[PDB]
Design an enzyme around this catalytic site. Structure first.
Site, PDB file in Angstrom:
ATOM      1  N   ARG A  34      -4.299  13.236 -40.669  1.00 52.64           N
ATOM      2  CA  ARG A  34      -4.039  13.286 -39.225  1.00 52.64           C
ATOM      3  C   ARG A  34      -3.691  14.697 -38.745  1.00 52.64           C
ATOM      4  O   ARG A  34      -3.619  14.963 -37.541  1.00 52.64           O
ATOM      5  CB  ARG A  34      -2.929  12.304 -38.835  1.00 52.64           C
ATOM      6  N   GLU A  42       0.724  10.348 -40.191  1.00 55.72           N
ATOM      7  CA  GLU A  42       0.391  11.720 -40.548  1.00 55.72           C
ATOM      8  C   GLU A  42       0.944  12.223 -41.878  1.00 55.72           C
ATOM      9  O   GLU A  42       1.819  13.092 -41.920  1.00 55.72           O
ATOM     10  CB  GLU A  42       0.822  12.655 -39.410  1.00 55.72           C
ATOM     11  N   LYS A  56       1.285   8.181 -30.952  1.00 57.51           N
ATOM     12  CA  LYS A  56       2.290   9.239 -30.898  1.00 57.51           C
ATOM     13  C   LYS A  56       2.926   9.324 -29.514  1.00 57.51           C
ATOM     14  O   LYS A  56       2.228   9.387 -28.501  1.00 57.51           O
ATOM     15  CB  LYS A  56       1.694  10.603 -31.257  1.00 57.51           C
ATOM     16  N   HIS A 112      -3.567  23.469 -32.290  1.00 54.93           N
ATOM     17  CA  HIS A 112      -2.233  23.183 -31.761  1.00 54.93           C
ATOM     18  C   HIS A 112      -1.090  23.948 -32.421  1.00 54.93           C
ATOM     19  O   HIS A 112      -0.020  24.085 -31.833  1.00 54.93           O
ATOM     20  CB  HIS A 112      -1.942  21.687 -31.843  1.00 54.93           C
ATOM     21  N   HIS A 162      -1.626  22.117 -21.101  1.00 62.11           N
ATOM     22  CA  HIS A 162      -1.776  21.847 -22.524  1.00 62.11           C
ATOM     23  C   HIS A 162      -3.159  22.139 -23.088  1.00 62.11           C
ATOM     24  O   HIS A 162      -3.292  22.871 -24.074  1.00 62.11           O
ATOM     25  CB  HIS A 162      -1.428  20.387 -22.823  1.00 62.11           C
ATOM     26  N   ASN A 217      -4.616  18.064 -35.013  1.00 60.02           N
ATOM     27  CA  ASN A 217      -3.761  19.120 -34.492  1.00 60.02           C
ATOM     28  C   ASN A 217      -4.418  20.503 -34.551  1.00 60.02           C
ATOM     29  O   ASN A 217      -3.738  21.515 -34.389  1.00 60.02           O
ATOM     30  CB  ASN A 217      -2.440  19.145 -35.272  1.00 60.02           C
ATOM     31  N   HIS A 253       0.536  25.155 -29.388  1.00 56.32           N
ATOM     32  CA  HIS A 253       1.873  24.725 -28.988  1.00 56.32           C
ATOM     33  C   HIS A 253       2.799  25.925 -28.838  1.00 56.32           C
ATOM     34  O   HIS A 253       3.648  25.953 -27.944  1.00 56.32           O
ATOM     35  CB  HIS A 253       2.453  23.757 -30.024  1.00 56.32           C
ATOM     36  N   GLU A 299      -9.644  18.994 -25.455  1.00 56.22           N
ATOM     37  CA  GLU A 299      -9.433  18.029 -26.535  1.00 56.22           C
ATOM     38  C   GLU A 299     -10.749  17.424 -27.010  1.00 56.22           C
ATOM     39  O   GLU A 299     -10.910  17.130 -28.194  1.00 56.22           O
ATOM     40  CB  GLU A 299      -8.499  16.903 -26.088  1.00 56.22           C
ATOM     41  N   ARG A 317      15.095  -1.728 -29.741  1.00 57.31           N
ATOM     42  CA  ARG A 317      14.428  -1.468 -31.015  1.00 57.31           C
ATOM     43  C   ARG A 317      12.921  -1.712 -30.993  1.00 57.31           C
ATOM     44  O   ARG A 317      12.299  -1.835 -32.049  1.00 57.31           O
ATOM     45  CB  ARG A 317      15.063  -2.295 -32.141  1.00 57.31           C
TER      46      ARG A 317
HETATM   47  O1  LIG Z   1      -2.062  13.110 -34.004  1.00 62.72           O
HETATM   48  C1  LIG Z   1      -2.379  13.236 -32.757  1.00 62.72           C
HETATM   49  O2  LIG Z   1      -2.725  12.292 -32.014  1.00 62.72           O
HETATM   50  C2  LIG Z   1      -2.311  14.688 -32.190  1.00 62.72           C
HETATM   51  O3  LIG Z   1      -2.443  15.616 -33.269  1.00 62.72           O
HETATM   52  C3  LIG Z   1      -0.867  14.776 -31.606  1.00 62.72           C
HETATM   53  C4  LIG Z   1      -0.669  16.084 -30.786  1.00 62.72           C
HETATM   54  C5  LIG Z   1       0.784  16.156 -30.365  1.00 62.72           C
HETATM   55  P1  LIG Z   1       2.008  16.613 -31.628  1.00 62.72           P
HETATM   56  O4  LIG Z   1       1.610  18.007 -32.224  1.00 62.72           O
HETATM   57  O5  LIG Z   1       3.287  16.744 -30.824  1.00 62.72           O
HETATM   58  O6  LIG Z   1       2.104  15.606 -32.711  1.00 62.72           O
HETATM   59  C6  LIG Z   1      -1.694  16.129 -29.639  1.00 62.72           C
HETATM   60  O7  LIG Z   1      -1.465  17.167 -28.741  1.00 62.72           O
HETATM   61  C7  LIG Z   1      -3.106  16.277 -30.289  1.00 62.72           C
HETATM   62  O8  LIG Z   1      -4.104  16.514 -29.268  1.00 62.72           O
HETATM   63  C8  LIG Z   1      -3.419  15.028 -31.129  1.00 62.72           C
HETATM   64  O1  LIG Z   2      19.197  -8.354 -38.415  1.00 58.79           O
HETATM   65  C1  LIG Z   2      20.294  -7.800 -38.837  1.00 58.79           C
HETATM   66  O2  LIG Z   2      20.365  -7.046 -39.835  1.00 58.79           O
HETATM   67  C2  LIG Z   2      21.584  -8.125 -38.009  1.00 58.79           C
HETATM   68  O3  LIG Z   2      21.406  -9.346 -37.300  1.00 58.79           O
HETATM   69  C3  LIG Z   2      21.691  -6.961 -36.996  1.00 58.79           C
HETATM   70  C4  LIG Z   2      22.977  -7.146 -36.128  1.00 58.79           C
HETATM   71  C5  LIG Z   2      22.924  -6.131 -35.007  1.00 58.79           C
HETATM   72  P1  LIG Z   2      21.849  -6.546 -33.619  1.00 58.79           P
HETATM   73  O4  LIG Z   2      22.364  -7.895 -33.005  1.00 58.79           O
HETATM   74  O5  LIG Z   2      22.067  -5.418 -32.616  1.00 58.79           O
HETATM   75  O6  LIG Z   2      20.429  -6.668 -34.047  1.00 58.79           O
HETATM   76  C6  LIG Z   2      24.226  -7.102 -37.019  1.00 58.79           C
HETATM   77  O7  LIG Z   2      25.391  -7.195 -36.289  1.00 58.79           O
HETATM   78  C7  LIG Z   2      24.169  -8.299 -38.017  1.00 58.79           C
HETATM   79  O8  LIG Z   2      25.341  -8.257 -38.868  1.00 58.79           O
HETATM   80  C8  LIG Z   2      22.877  -8.264 -38.850  1.00 58.79           C
HETATM   81 ZN   LIG Z   3      -3.193  18.173 -27.696  1.00 61.26          ZN
END
Ligand SMILES: O=C(O)[C@]1(O)C[C@H](CP(=O)(O)O)[C@@H](O)[C@H](O)C1
Ligand SMILES: O=C(O)[C@]1(O)C[C@H](CP(=O)(O)O)[C@@H](O)[C@H](O)C1
Ligand SMILES: [Zn+2]
Ligand SMILES: [Cl-]
Ligand SMILES: [Zn+2]
EC number: 4.2.3.4
Lengths: 385, 382
Positions: free
Chosen positions: B253, B249, B149, B260, B276, B257, B264, B191, B127
């Site tokens: 932001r 964004e 990003k 793009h 690119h 783009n 793209h 860029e 996470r």
């Molecule tokens: O927000 C950003 O950083 C960008 O807009 C992000 C794009 C990629 P995205 O269109 O996949 O968000 C990038 O190519 C551009 O040069 C800058």
């Molecule tokens: O922070 C939370 O919400 C939790 O600790 C999140 C866990 C999952 P995790 O151990 O993968 O973070 C869940 O089992 C628990 O009941 C509550």
């Molecule tokens: Zn770009």
């Protein structure tokens, strides 16, 4: 109609019947969009989708042009919190005509599985789209659907890949409990008891005293008549304390560790006994061993421990890896100490190789405002059945 | 040693030699941890890893128990920004002994590919874990490594799955440019020009003037170092500004783009033979021509946009002989281009949004603008 706030917003709505006559309407007004994606499993869908489609189409008619509702049915079971399933739902969304964009509002209808999966898909879809939670299980209503934690499992373990993505709305409809299997209901109580054990002795006493009444209603095949408000009070206390902790430490810098009480050992147990044994059940045994650990460390009194055991037992939750019922279901699955230790190495609260576990000093009050480092040797002791 | 702030933190450090004698030391002190995971590609690794391992082990010798440095080499090329490679790195990180945990500090060493990939892995690993950016390409130094990003591609398109995860540190080491292939350098200029075109006419002019000096050095930046650095920093500074004002964004932001939307679309077809920045170059011309067709941008500014891109050796047309050869068997029909733009992440529902410039240095709005699909069909053929 009760509302709880989390991270500065009143995203949580709790009432009976929200699904039948509130969600659809609320989504259209507060979650404005041209596209709505509903995710569930084949079981839940077949029972609750038809109702919603008509409620949606009925609220969409007014809007012109009407937004669309797309439904995706994933296989039931833990097997669906996988990379494969995440990718399948993603490709499906992108290949729609027109493709689902960043205005997409995803709807998670189901328990922790659907919730964790769906929430995770929303967090990374085009780098993030809105989503709402519609918990259909007790465990989901009292825990999983709140706080933003999402994830999928990998061959190596549970909840190893994921993200903290807060849902825009949380719809807790007690009516879903009407059809929830007894076992599932018992499963969720494991989290309710956990939440009380780390927050207040008064709420915990309430669970002890309410056990019988709650259980009789759950065991009577007829459904929460004269116990409704009691049920809502127990659920809400759980939901309110989590919202509190999540609001104070959303990404788990410390305090949010406490919500993981019983999960350090619980998750270890689970990685082995799953999918025959459920999450809450594993966490039940987990709370006992972690409670016994706090005892072995002179933190928790021997009395509170026994009391923890009595409450879990009272709600029909296992309190030992030796439980007759657990063995029959697992065909004998053995939880070897070395396996339980290996699995605990993957615990997310660990600071480097230092195993951290929530330690209670008394029912209602944790030892610290976070998990505590515990020598691997002190963990070995309580892991031997 | 230049430091730039973004989102209220002085995360950006810019200097020559940071890699050889600053990163390792800085990671240990400001990014305290027991585990460091470095991700790159087989090419970049073999040339810059050996140096770092010793610098790390030399700074780690103090701390005790000793912190570890784990290195993962991914295949070079766009092919690595995939679900498979994301999964592989994660399984490898979870399989370590002990397993890489939430204290893990990931190090992205490479260009946009490695950066986008690595950053995405860090955002969802248990996470979310910390990570730093070490851009080895011009494009990465002036754009990709800044702003948070991240993403990988899917069979259906580019950057469709991802996350905004801010790196704890951004190490811009101009020395990496010493070995950067001419083409790659030109790629990144696309860029730099884009960033100026949406912020200041003054800066865009400077780019017009440094055009020859920069190119002569590229075709090792002795008496032009301060010129190069000033151009790089202006680019990085404006992005940090926009990202600070509109991180996820919700509007402003969009401007980053520019070029793009169509770029793209072009890219999804000509990739991986065409790069690119190159695609974004053609993209800027068409989107500039679009702003003209809409009476927003003057015909003079558009031509000027073309002159600057050409001056740095960037294509300004799908016809361009260079692109033709390189992609012998690939065409860009108005249809395929349109189907591709449908997947643009800025589209508000079926409404295709595109950044429109009213003049070099100033956008029409503080966000992309809805544009009828018919007005897009016009400039998509030239
Ligand atoms: O927000 C950003 O950083 C960008 O807009 C992000 C794009 C990629 P995205 O269109 O996949 O968000 C990038 O190519 C551009 O040069 C800058
Ligand atoms: O922070 C939370 O919400 C939790 O600790 C999140 C866990 C999952 P995790 O151990 O993968 O973070 C869940 O089992 C628990 O009941 C509550
Ligand atoms: Zn770009
Ligand atoms: Cl993912
Ligand atoms: Zn749990």
């Amino acid at each position: 109609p009760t509302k709880i706030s989390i991270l500065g917003r009143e995203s949580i709505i709790a009432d009976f019947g929200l699904w039948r006559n509130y969600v659809a309407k609320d989504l259209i007004s507060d979650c404005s969009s041209t596209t709505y994606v509903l995710v569930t499993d084949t079981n839940i869908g077949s029972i609750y989708t038809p109702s919603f489609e008509e409620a949606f189409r009925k609220r969409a008619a007014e809007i012109t042009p009407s937004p669309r509702l797309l439904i995706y049915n994933r296989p039931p079971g833990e097997v669906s919190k996988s990379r494969q399933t995440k990718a399948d739902i993603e490709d499906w969304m992108l290949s729609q005509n027109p493709p689902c964009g960043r205005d997409t509002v995803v709807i998670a209808l189901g328990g922790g599985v659907i919730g964790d999966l769906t929430g995770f898909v929303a967090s990374t879809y085009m780098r993030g789209v809105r989503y709402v939670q519609v918990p259909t299980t007790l465990l989901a209503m009292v825990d999983s659907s709140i706080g933003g934690k999402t994830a999928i499992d990998t061959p190596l373990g549970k909840n190893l890949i994921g993200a903290i993505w807060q849902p825009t709305k949380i719809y807790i409809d007690l009516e879903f409990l009407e059809t929830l299997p007894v076992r599932e209901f018992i499963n969720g109580m494991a989290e309710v008891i956990k939440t009380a054990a780390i927050s207040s002795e008064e709420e915990f006493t309430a669970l002890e005293e309410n056990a019988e009444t709650i259980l009789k209603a759950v065991r009577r095949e007829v459904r929460f008549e004269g116990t409704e408000e009691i049920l809502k009070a127990r659920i809400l206390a759980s939901a309110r304390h989590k919202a509190y902790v999540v609001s104070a430490d959303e990404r788990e810098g410390g305090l949010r560790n406490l919500l993981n009480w019983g999960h350090s050992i619980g998750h270890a147990i689970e990685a082995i006994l799953t999918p025959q044994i459920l999450h809450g059940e594993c966490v039940a045994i987990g709370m006992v061993k972690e409670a016994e650990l706090a005892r072995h460390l002179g933190i928790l009194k021997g009395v509170a421990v026994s009391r923890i055991v009595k409450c879990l037992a009272a709600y029909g939750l296992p309190t030992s890896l030796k439980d007759a019922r657990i063995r029959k279901l697992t065909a004998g699955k053995h939880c070897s100490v070395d396996q339980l230790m290996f699995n605990m190495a993957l615990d997310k609260k660990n600071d480097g190789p230092k195993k951290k576990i929530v330690l209670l000093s008394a029912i209602g009050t944790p030892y610290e405002t976070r998990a505590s480092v515990v020598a691997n040797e002190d963990i070995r002791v309580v892991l031997a059945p």
